[model samples]
Target: MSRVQLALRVPDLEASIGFYSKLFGTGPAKVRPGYANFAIAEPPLKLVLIEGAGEDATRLDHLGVEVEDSAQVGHAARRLKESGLATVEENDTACCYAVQDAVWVTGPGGEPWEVYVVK
Candidate 1:
């Protein structure tokens, strides 16, 4: 079962982790010095908390939603486009040397959204 992951750039890792853990009703599934991840099974949303990367750490740098199949990717793209959302195209993108199909959407407040289907 594929899930949606939302990685957030937070100001305080500990505080945000606590907040999100309570909100999502799950403990951190993975944690390191500068990152924490909560796998929200009920809603199938993986919430990741990160800190200490750069100056622009408080805002959302980018986000991604991974679907089960490529057809779902095309459906989401069409829906966003038809709803007048700005969309960008990407394919076979190498991240850690793994290729994936992704569509980018620039949401309000400079938040970049990546709707993707991973193989």
Candidate 2:
């Protein structure tokens, strides 16, 4: 099954981690020096938190769809492209502490969206 993902850039990693831990009722599924993620099964949510500023920290980090495999990523990318959206493909890229194959798209509102599979 595909999972909805939310990647956010937080000013304070440790503080955000503590808050999310309480809110999620569990610790992160993965954590690195500047990143953490909670894989919530109840709601099928992948919540990714990143520390420090990104290109435009004032805006949202990004949104994503986490698929089961590379094929699914490609399928979603192709479908998006067919619908006249432009995409950028990144294969085996390290992101959020995991290797992922992803296709990136910019939304009408200028937010980024990714269709990806962890490798």
The residue-by-residue lDDT of candidate 1 on 45-117, one tens digit each, is 8676778555545656467887777777888899999999989867777752237788889768777788887
Candidate 2 per-residue lDDT over residues 13-92, each given as its tens digit: 88889999999898999888988899999789899988875443423689999999999999998999999999999998
User: How does residue 105 of candidate 2 score in lDDT?
Assistant: 95
Pairs of residues at least 3 apart in sequence or in different chains that clash in candidate 2: none
> What TM-score, to 2 decimals, does candidate 2 have?
0.91
- Please report, in order, the local distance difference test score of every candidate based on alpha carbons: 0.77, 0.88
TM-score of each: 0.61, 0.91
TM-score quality measure for candidate 1: 0.61
lDDT of 1 at 63: 78
Question: How accurate locally is residue 96 in candidate 2, as Cα lDDT from 0 to 100?
Answer: 60
Candidate 2 residues lying further than 4 Å off, grouped into runs, are 53-59
